[PDB]
């Protein structure tokens with residue numbers, strides 16, 4: 001069966017690393033590979049053959065005009081934000097939630113916490129304290145999803161892969177229910 | 178010793194073959210949508226890089242700018258195209274996925290009924306070839322049901338495809354006319 | 358030390374960069390464009406077949422097949438051009454510019470040393486070796502000769518690319534009317 005999953009969310013969050021890590025098992029680091037590319041994956045979800053189409057997007061205002069063009073015929077959205085970036089998280093409701101719905105008000109959405117590693121590390125833990133800010137806790141991310149209607153809330157690191165595979169296994173279940 | 182509704186079975190085979198081919202055009206259309214979307218975006222970036230280079234390079238101001246304007250125009254006209262294609266895919270997905278599946282769902286009930294009726298009479302014969310005795314509705318009813326559905330389905334297939342092929346073609350053509 | 362050169366070198370790097378970022382968007386353009394032709398090739402075949410096998414919709418599958426086909430044909434030419442673009446620019450980046458940037462690493466290996474050994478051996482003085490300029494010539498005359506090349510290659514490269522894109526659409530609309 002063919003399922004279309006599109007990953008959106010404030011630029012710099014890690015949507016591309018989220019898709020390259022998951023599909024090829026390598027961090028997009030080492031040069032930053034083929035721009036505006038899309039990814040797909042074949043997965044066995046409970047004795048079932050699934051053809052998973054993954055659509056990448058751009059998070060900077062400049063691509064606002066030609067983003068909705070990828071939305072039609074979607075089966076599940078993944079609004080992303082960085083647990084190390086409070087400014088982003090807020091935009092989850094500020095920009096993304098309204099847009100995705102403005103076009104597809106009936107599609108299952110899932111919230112994801114990109115960069116679950118740089119949440120307990122020595123540096124961003126100080127500089128993020130140098131700006132008078134702090135990481136994103138489970139609540140509010142868990143509440144953000146609920147504040148929305150997200151069929152699910154998950155967290156993962158494209159660097160550690162931890163919680164990565166679950167993200168897409170859920171997107172599929174959120175589809176065929 | 179097998180029941181055959183020749184004309185009807187020939188149409189069922191042709192509908193299965195058509196769905197097969199349509200599902201294939203449908204997969205291509207999806208890929209078309211991805212690739213188009215990837216292209217469109219690049220042309221946008223490319224449009225910026227060039228425009229930037231145009232200003233930070235007077236020696237090549239006119240050359241970079243000329244290309245920036247083109248990559249920008251194309252990007253814009255390619256949004257109208259990507260839209261038209263999404264419409265093509267979506268429309269045909271309904272036809273295959275829903276309209277055609279509705280009929281096939283009825284074709285399966287009819288075949289199941291045809292085969293049980295065959296097993297029934299066969300059992301009757303290898304029972305007669307014993308202590309002697311030498312003296313269908315579900316199948317017939319279902320047989321009529323599919324005949325009707327195949328007819329409506331074919332009528333609808335022609336209208337939908339005639340429109341979708343016409344527009345898809347025009348969009349593809351327009352992505353050169355207003356682009357020229 | 359010497360300002361001019363090291364302002365000329367700071368610009369050969371910002372430039373080597375923008376052209377590197379253009380080289381990226383260019384590899385992508387190639388990729389995404391190649392994919393599009395495969396699909397178009399496949400779509401025209403799928404359309405031709407359906408056209409022969411479906412009399413009810415023979416015309417409709419018919420002209421869609423042709424269009425997709427000429428489109429694939431023209432697209433291969435465009436792809437040739439785009440490949441040439443990226444390649445050539447790539448040469449002007451991986452070689453011609455490196456060759457200039459290498460004699461710069463050398464020049465620098467013998468650049469701060471004269472300014473260093475100066476503030477250094479400056480400390481020992483009053484108590485009670487010259488080809489830094491040979492490499493200097495190989496970072497000024499190797500450099501300026503590079504900029505003329507930039508202009509020469511980019512001017513031509515930028516134009517073929519543009520005409521190619523243009524031709525692409527001209528040939529299309531053209532042949533897309535002989536029907």
Ligand SMILES: Nc1nc2c(ncn2[C@@H]2O[C@H](COP(=O)(O)OP(=O)(O)NP(=O)(O)O)[C@@H](O)[C@H]2O)c(=O)[nH]1
Nearest residue numbers: 011012013014015016017058059115118157158159
């Ligand atoms: N530690 C860590 N760094 C990450 C992770 N994901 C992304 N990054 C880093 O975050 C930066 C941005 O990643 P990127 O994938 O480009 O984000 P994006 O959302 O795709 N941005 P855009 O919308 O502009 O394309 C990169 O420097 C990348 O290495 C992660 O899970 N962990």
Ligand SMILES: [Mg+2]
Nearest residue numbers: 015016057058
């Ligand atoms: Mg990205």
